[PDB]
Ligand binder design. Structure first.
Ligand SMILES: [Mg+2]
Ligand SMILES: [Mg+2]
Ligand SMILES: [Mg+2]
Ligand SMILES: [Mg+2]
Ligand SMILES: [Mg+2]
Ligand SMILES: [Mg+2]
Ligand SMILES: [Mg+2]
Ligand SMILES: [Mg+2]
Ligand SMILES: [Mg+2]
Ligand SMILES: [Mg+2]
Lengths: 87, 13, 213, 52, 224
RNA sequence: UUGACAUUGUGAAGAGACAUAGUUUCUUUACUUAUUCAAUGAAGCGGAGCUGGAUCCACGUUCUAGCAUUCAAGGUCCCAUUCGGGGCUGAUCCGGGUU
RNA sequence: GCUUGUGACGGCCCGUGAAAAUCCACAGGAAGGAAUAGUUUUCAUGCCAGGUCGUACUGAUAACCGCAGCAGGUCUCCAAG
RNA sequence: GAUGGGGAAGCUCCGUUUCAAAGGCCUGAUUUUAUGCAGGCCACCAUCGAAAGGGAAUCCGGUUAAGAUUCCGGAACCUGG
């Protein structure tokens, strides 16, 4: 096995920031916040913030990556896209 | 239960 | 008849230049707004030998005018330029050895090197060691400059073409006898496969127009 | 170098690691003297413009 | 405030890094953007023969607004209300419809048979040969016509995306006077006003720098 | 290598042809818009400033192997003062041509 | 003493004698962080894991090529008195 | 040696970053017009090519008919979390 790359496993993979989550879900900020309120997705705190955010101490909103991945399959998101097309 | 297509949901929270 | 070496060289193959150890192409800066209107300062960091070239090269570092970083350029070193020297390039640069000036900003009798054939080609004339170009005169109405080339030819160039003040360093090189096939061998090992040369008379009639007897 | 502590890779000074002590001293001296000379040049030029 | 200081930046040559500036003039656009802009520029720069160049003189804003107000009262029967008419006719087993005529072949036939009261021709038709014969045909047959800006506007008139032409043939008694007044207005504002200048060549326009060069050279010749 | 035709456009001035109303033919001299060459980070081109100093210039950079980066500090109107956030400037304007 | 490694030096060139992955340091300072409590996984100790393919033997007057168990050919390391 | 492009009747050929819209990242209650994404940043090229070039980290003792820095016993180290 070759040497693995840092900042890819552990906190770095376990936590996803708000910008990354919005980009991955391909929605707007307003739609994303409303989806989180509907499903009960809540912000989270890594024990190692620098390890989670590539060494930065900047204040960041983090979520569970598996929570966002499960949020990808919510049919209300498809309803949001339908409403945009209708508008 | 097992996947038949490439995109699946399978509904486990 | 059989294809001769004069025709065989154009296909490339074993006649391509030997460029592993070369320092890089020796060019002036790209002609930009700073050199077109004012001047920009660089610093001579090192003077190095380039394999296959008689003239030494100088590595000159400038600041990037649009981004916080450094830019390294590879000049041909003029005689007298030393490490740690400040070099000034542009329209408003002073008449000092090592500076890069447009031809219209220098008076008659100025000695330049690495002169641009056209404004922006980054140096084409008087680049070999000990060679230089002399400014014969100006035609300000046509924005033109008459110069004398190392071969003796007189040329007319745009006055916006640039040049480096002074003479290419390394002069007097060809005055020393090589004395030896081995020294010619090492000279051409760093340039290209054109040595040794077999005389066409020495060949059979098939190999050359001159062969046979 | 990634297997050793920071003590082994630096010294307790500005540019410790990258630059040696005499070169650091030279850039300190030059920075100070050149900034003072810049103040002098601005003063001289302002006087020259005021009189001219 | 004792803690604040003024540190003005020198943005001259050989000084501080240049600030960000609007470089919209220097943007390397995509090839399709460059093509469409250069195509419009070429259509300006080249000398344009009169049969094409006549399509630069259209109805003015007020006349076009009144014309479209008239035609919107005769927008044709839509697909949703067509189905309602059919069910009513099956029960009966409907008066004569009034609508805008559209379609290039149909309108050409109506002009040739002199059934067209007023013809609107879109100026931005490509390929332009589909409409470049229409003004001469209308003049030859004695049909009032007007060149209007917007095939998309004509498409809104007849429930389509675009429409090269539209025509009014029959109008209601409540709008006969409006139609006649509009025809007189079009004759006074479009056909008579642009009658001479439609016989002139177009596109004798130089670019900005070439114009500046010509102006400088002429000034230099006239005064020293 | 040399000539022709096609690619091939727009002016102006001078010599003709309709018998002294402007449809064409040729020389001179221009132009750019087709075509051709080259470069770039398509970054500062072209013109003008009731811009400034003296037709020209930015008086923002030349003893020295330093430094130059976080929407730029400062100035001035606001907000609703709360950890700060906006706009005008700082850094003139215009263009239908990246050079 | 022999062999080998290495240092500080000298001679030589119209010859001045690879690249990249990768690792570190500095400059900078967006930021974050304590009083009845913070910070620091470049100090120590403690926890978990490390897949796939090769691996026998000859390397030559008989294990390779030369129709062969052919006096030919075929790159290299160690090396006592 | 592909792609973007351009040659060639065509099998295919040029060329290797150009001649391309060639993709990553940050912030947001965007002063709300009521259920539609806004403000910004940074930038150059696929891939293959070395069991003698570069390169993270392992040693001793024992053991077999035939294996061994790989197994057993003991003692370490590297990398990632
Ligand atoms: Mg012979
Ligand atoms: Mg073995
Ligand atoms: Mg063996
Ligand atoms: Mg054999
Ligand atoms: Mg055989
Ligand atoms: Mg190929
Ligand atoms: Mg490889
Ligand atoms: Mg190796
Ligand atoms: Mg064995
Ligand atoms: Mg073991």
């Amino acid at each position: 096995m070759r040497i693995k790359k840092k900042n890819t496993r552990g906190n770095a993979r376990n936590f996803i920031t708000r910008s990354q989550a919005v980009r991955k879900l391909q929605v707007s900020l307003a739609d994303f916040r409303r989806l989180c309120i509907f499903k009960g997705i809540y912000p989270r705190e890594p024990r190692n913030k620098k390890k989670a955010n590539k060494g930065s101490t900047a204040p960041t909103t983090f979520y569970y990556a598996k929570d966002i991945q499960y949020l990808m399959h919510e049919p209300v998101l498809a309803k949001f896209r339908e409403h945009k097309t209708f508008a | 239960k097992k996947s038949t297509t490439s995109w699946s949901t399978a509904s486990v929270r | 008849g059989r294809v001769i070496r004069n025709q065989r060289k154009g296909a490339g193959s074993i006649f391509t230049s030997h460029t592993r150890l070369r320092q890089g192409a020796a060019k002036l800066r790209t002609l930009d707004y700073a050199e077109r209107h004012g001047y920009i300062r660089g610093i001579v960091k090192q003077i190095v030998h380039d394999s296959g070239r008689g003239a030494p090269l100088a590595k000159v570092v400038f600041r990037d005018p649009y981004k916080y970083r450094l830019r390294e350029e590879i000049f041909i070193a003029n005689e007298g330029v030393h490490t740690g020297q400040f070099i000034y390039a542009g329209k408003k640069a002073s008449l000092n050895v090592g500076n890069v000036l447009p031809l219209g900003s220098v008076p008659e009798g100025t000695i330049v090197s690495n002169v641009e054939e056209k404004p922006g080609d980054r140096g084409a004339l008087a680049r070999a060691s000990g060679n230089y170009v002399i400014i014969i005169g100006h035609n300000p109405d046509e924005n033109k400059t008459r110069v004398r080339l190392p071969s003796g030819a007189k040329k007319v160039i745009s006055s916006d073409a640039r040049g480096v003040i002074g003479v290419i360093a390394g002069g007097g090189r060809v005055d020393k006898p090589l004395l030896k096939a081995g020294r010619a061998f090492h000279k051409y090992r760093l340039k290209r496969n054109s040595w040794p040369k077999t005389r066409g008379v020495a060949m059979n009639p098939v190999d050359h127009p001159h062969g046979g007897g | 170098y990634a297997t050793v502590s920071k003590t082994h890779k630096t010294v307790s000074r500005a540019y410790g690691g990258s630059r040696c002590a005499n070169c650091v001293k030279e850039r300190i001296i030059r920075a100070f003297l050149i900034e003072e000379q810049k103040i002098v040049k601005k003063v001289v030029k302002e006087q020259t413009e005021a009189a001219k | 405030n004792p803690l604040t200081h003024s540190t003005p930046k020198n943005f001259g040559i050989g000084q501080a890094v240049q600030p960000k500036r609007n470089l919209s003039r220097y943007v390397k656009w995509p090839e399709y953007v460059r093509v469409q802009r250069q195509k419009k520029i070429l259509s300006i720069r080249l000398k344009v023969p009169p049969t094409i160049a006549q399509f630069q003189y259209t109805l003015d804003r007020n006349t076009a607004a009144e014309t479209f107000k008239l035609f919107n009262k005769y927008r044709p029967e839509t697909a949703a209300e067509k189905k309602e008419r059919l069910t009513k006719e099956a029960a009966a087993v409907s008066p004569k419809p009034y609508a805008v005529k559209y379609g290039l072949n149909h309108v050409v036939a109506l002009i040739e048979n002199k059934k067209a009261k007023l013809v609107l021709i879109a100026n931005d038709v490509d390929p332009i040969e589909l409409v470049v014969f229409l003004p001469a045909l209308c003049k030859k047959m004695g049909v009032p016509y007007a060149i209007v800006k917007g095939k998309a506007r004509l498409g809104t008139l007849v429930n389509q995306k675009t429409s090269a032409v539209a025509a009014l043939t029959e109008v209601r008694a409540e709008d006969e006077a409006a139609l006649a007044k509009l025809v007189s207005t079009i004759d006074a504002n479009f056909a008579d006003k642009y009658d001479e200048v439609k016989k002139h060549w177009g596109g004798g326009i130089l670019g900005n720098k070439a114009q500046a060069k010509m102006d400088k050279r002429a000034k230099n010749s006239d005064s020293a």
